[PDB]
Amino acid sequence: AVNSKYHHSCINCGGLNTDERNERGLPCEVCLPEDSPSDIYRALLERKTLKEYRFYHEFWNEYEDFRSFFKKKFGKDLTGYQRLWAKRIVQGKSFTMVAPTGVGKTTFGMMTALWLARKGKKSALVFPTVTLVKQTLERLQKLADEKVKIFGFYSSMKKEEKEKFEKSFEEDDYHILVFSTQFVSKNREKLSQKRFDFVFVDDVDAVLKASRNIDTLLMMVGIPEEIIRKAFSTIKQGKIYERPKNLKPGILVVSSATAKPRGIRPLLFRDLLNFTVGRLVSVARNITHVRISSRSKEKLVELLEIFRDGILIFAQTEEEGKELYEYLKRFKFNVGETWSEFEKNFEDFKVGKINILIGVQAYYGKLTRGVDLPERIKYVIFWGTPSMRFSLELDKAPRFVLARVLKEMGLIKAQENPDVEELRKIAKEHLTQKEFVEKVKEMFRGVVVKDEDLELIIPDVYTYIQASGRSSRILNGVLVKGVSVIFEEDEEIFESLKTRLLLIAEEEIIEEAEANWKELVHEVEESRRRSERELTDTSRSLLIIVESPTKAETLSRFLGRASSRKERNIIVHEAVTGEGVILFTATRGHVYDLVTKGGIHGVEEENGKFVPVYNSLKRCRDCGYQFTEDRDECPVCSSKNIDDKTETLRALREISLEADEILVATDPDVEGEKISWDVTQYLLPSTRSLRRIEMHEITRYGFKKARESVRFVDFNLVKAQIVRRVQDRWIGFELSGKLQKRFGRSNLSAGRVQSTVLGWIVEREEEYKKSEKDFTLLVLENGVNLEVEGKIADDVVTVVELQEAEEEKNPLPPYTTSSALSEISQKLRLGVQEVMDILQDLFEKGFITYHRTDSTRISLEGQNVARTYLRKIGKEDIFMGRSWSTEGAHEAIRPVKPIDARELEEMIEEGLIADLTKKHLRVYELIFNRFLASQSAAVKVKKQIVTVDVDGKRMGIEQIVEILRDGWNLFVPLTVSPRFEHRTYKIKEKKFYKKHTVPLFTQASIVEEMKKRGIGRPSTYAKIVEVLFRRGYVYEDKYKRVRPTRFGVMVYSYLKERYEKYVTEETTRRLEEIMDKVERGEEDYQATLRLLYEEIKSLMEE
Ligand SMILES: [Zn+2]
């Protein structure tokens, strides 16, 4: 711990407790004065302070009984899925049963109903078919005692049982009632007037067939139609609805939606039960994609002879399907078809009578609308790449083509245009077919433009993913292996497909050379027989906490957002993986912050040591004002509509009970570690299993490698966060006050660094007007222009000595935060803050590596990205992998995927990925080009060093002339220059002037400078500049230079006159150095706090 206080962190009294106690999962000293108590519950009860801890005790005890009961009545222990479901059941929570192929939902439903009836609770079990009612009641009756009132209802019911069920359901206080969905639909009013504690729905689709059934099931727990209709109007509007806090419903449990959850009705579950009826979108895949260069049926024969069994062939059309079918039939292979004898061959393949199934892209995907046996399909063969083909003529042209063409050409003025109308609009404007196809070849990058036969081929990645997916799912807790083979000869098509597969599924396609068929077939078969074995369960549930919503969204993109529980302030998503379930949620920033209330501006002092005091953050959803103090309304606009991180914290504490293991996935910096600690410390009394993961990339790889890096919270980083925060708080407050008494305004000084930088700008104004040195520009005859010192008047330049040398020029290292901000904000006409934000969205959308780095280091994987991209662009001989740095916390800002900006624009306009502005694309382009240059070969150049005499001055001039051999100059331009000959060049034009030696600052120049001086860190750079702008201390002019205002000058003048020590660059740098030493556990936390205090105490007197 760091010995600090958190305001609502007590597990029992719900109040203030120290970091150190929560760490030991203890209540506050008020609740329990003792150091190391014997047993918490017992001791709380003894001191008569037992309050909220009871909930947890009773929770644990009410669950461990369930588990115990289940382990007694049934075979063995609970599966991970059933474990999480059980923990949700004792909380009375309603949910979908998110899980793979037959994890035993019916077993859980039964044992739940049984365990509840054991207490006196009444439950109902709903099934689609009338046969399932029979089978379930059968299994129930033999395990249930006489104490349990069991009834049933279905089609083939008896003559006295049908009425027995009705009278008993009317008065006789039943326990468990097993019936069909038909009964629900038919006897709506009867059930609606009854109250159930537990309702188990086996098939959600059958019950969602009617709209009436939603209201029926909702009224089966005790919810009036008033709340239902009000919520209905709210969901008809387009916003969320709030359940009355005074409501205690039963437990509704359903399975995953097979078909799409169509309609408005399911939203009632989102407000009344806080669970969404999700569809099973399982992205869990273990497929090996191999590509064969030729559509040779001989290769196909050889492959088929290796695979032998359970092969699925996909043809583009049925014609090539029939052709392939004939060729294989002739070569004596047990084969089937989908076009002729669909059902017969389908089931014959299902059983094993057929080894090879040949289908079409559109035929199979629609015939298999029912079953689709996964335990049979090991290998998927693609006879050609699945793709969408369009014609490139002035006629036969699709909408999106003429759209992207005319929008760029200039015609598209936005008024929605009919296709044939657009054809007739382009029929006059740059109209030839030749001109057209050329505009298409020029615009469309990341598709295949067959300009030969006038065609456009767009590989259907989705279809490939689904179809390939048919060879790998989760069976008996085992994610079985599958091989997907593609037979493609067109390199352009294969490359396009590969890029969009890497983009969406992050899955690679390998070549036939780098693939051992014997080994692969073996892995497949072995995993299959491993799943055939008797399962002993390894599945666990896992909670992953991140700070920003974007991270959660892109995480859901590769984990698959099946269902989303709305828990107070947050939205926790759930996903199915091969290792078990996986819950992930976003905090939506910081939770705690230093209190302004007491001690030394929030920092208290006891026993010679400093104690930081934190309180939950509150943000008014109206005006946007943030505060720490506990108030009912907004201190500014007096509004009650606020966001309280204490609710978020409570929500986390709730979720933490269901999860077996927890991982905090905040950013890999001091900020992130501090948040991670504010969270882990708070949760620590609730869950014993809490660890830390640092994701440098927001992708499956970043995540896997992040979990390789699993560790506990590093207190040195937390300590460093604290120190920096305390410095800004103390110095900021003191200086700001001193300014309140001089310039009227309250909040003015954000810290020391800010004032230092502003000082740089202010005095720069002075030293700029003084650098005014007289100069002269010279346009030389059939040569370059030369910039030389003022007084020249000879009109002739003589060449004195001339020497040339061959040299290989190295590219610039990859972007770091400083580099990226400077170059990008210079090349673009943007502020460093705008750039920093674009970078943040870029990292958070998993497109680049961590954007807050002071290292240029590049891993073998980064180098590999560069390599594959170069191999893709054909210029792979120019690849030169460079680590760039050994000393590195993180890597430099680089792309995560070998995809350029143009291809991304294509994927965006196409609709594969979304949410990227033009600015994002341009920034990405800059990062990309920098990185590749840094990974491309050294450009071999012949440069000359010309010594020239101009007006009795021997002045050398070094210039590159010939580029002997290309390299990184393809990404980042390399400028040549006309050769000088050892003669006399005459001056054409002399443009005399006086431009300044020391130029003004630009935002880029300021960042560069503070990086050059050792002031600020990667996180603070842009924020510092922006603060300077927000406070009105600085402005930008015509040519976008940074200039101080009247106010800024007044302020820095005051601060320099009086408080020069606390604004001096030497002091700022010395402190920056020391704090950074604290971050590495090289300098003492409490000691530097003592230092900052000792200078603050000195400042309170001046
Ligand atoms: Zn307490």
Ligand SMILES: [Zn+2]
């Ligand atoms: Zn407000």
